[PDB]
C-alpha cells in the first residue's frame with residue numbers, strides 16, 4: 001500500500017499495464033466481498049492479453065469483470081450492493097490453490113471502442129484475524145493491455161437456468177439448459193460454474209449429431225475459479241450446448257427457485273477468430289429437453305467437495 005507503481009505503466013509503443021488494486025481496505029467480518037472499479041484510460045479498442053494476481057495470506061478469491069456502469073462511483077464498495085448495474089462480463093477469476101491458467105498465445109479479450117467495456121470491476125473476497133490495528137489491504141490484479149489486434153478474441157458463453165424449482169426434500173433435482181449454436185466456430189478453453197449452497201455438480205457439453213463431448217464438470221461448492229479445458233472443444237454452427245446443474249432440496253423447508261434463492265450458471269470461456277468474433281453470447285432456455293434423456297451417465301455422478 002506504499003506502492004509507487006502508478007495506475008498505468010506504458011510498456012513499449014503499443015501496450016500498457018493497468019494495476020487494479022484495492023485502495024487500502026479493512027476486511028472486518030469473514031466472508032467479506034469488496035468491489036472497486038477502474039476506467040480504461042483509452043477510448044479506442046484494446047485487448048487484454050494477460051493477468052497477474054497480486055493477492056495477500058487472507059485473500060480467498062478475486063474476480064475481474066468488464067462493464068460500462070459499475071454499481072458505485074465510490075473508492076470501493078461491498079459487492080452485495082452489486083457489481084455493475086449493466087451486464088457484468090467476467091474476464092478473470094483467481095482462487096487460492098487453483099491454477100488460474102493463462103490466455104493462450106494470440107488470444108485477447110476486446111475492450112474499449114464503441115462496443116467494448118469501458119470499465120473493469122474487481123471483486124476481492126476475504127477469508128480474518130481479530131487483532132491487526134486495522135490492517136490496510138491493496139490486493140488485486142495487474143492487467144496487460146495492447147492496442148495491437150489479436151488474431152483470436154476471447155469471450156464468454158454464459159448458460160443460465162431460470163425455469164426450474166427445487167421442491168423441499170427431493171434429494172436430486174436436475175436443472176437442464178440447452179441452445180442451438182449458430183455463430184462462427186468458438187473454441188472453449190476454460191469454464192467456471194456457479195450455484196449457491198444447494199448445488200452438487202455442474203456439467204457442460206457440446207452435442208453434435210447426438211454425440212456428447214464434455215466441456216467441463218465441477219462441484220460448485222469448490223472455489224468458483226476458471227478451470228482449464230484439457231483439450232479445447234470446438235463448438236460450431238449446428239451444435240447444441242447443453243448443461244445440467246444437479247441440486248438437492250434436502251433439509252429445505254419450502255421450495256427453492258433458480259433466481260438470485262438458487263442459480264445455475266455455467267461460464268464457458270472461448271476464443272474465436274478475430275473477424276468473426278463476439279465477446280459474449282448466452283443461453284437461458286432448454287430447447288432440447290428430450291436429448292437429456294440421452295445425457296452421459298457421468299453428468300450425474302457426484303464430485304465430493
Ligand SMILES: [Cu+2]
Pocket residue numbers: 194195196260263
Ligand atoms: Cu449467485
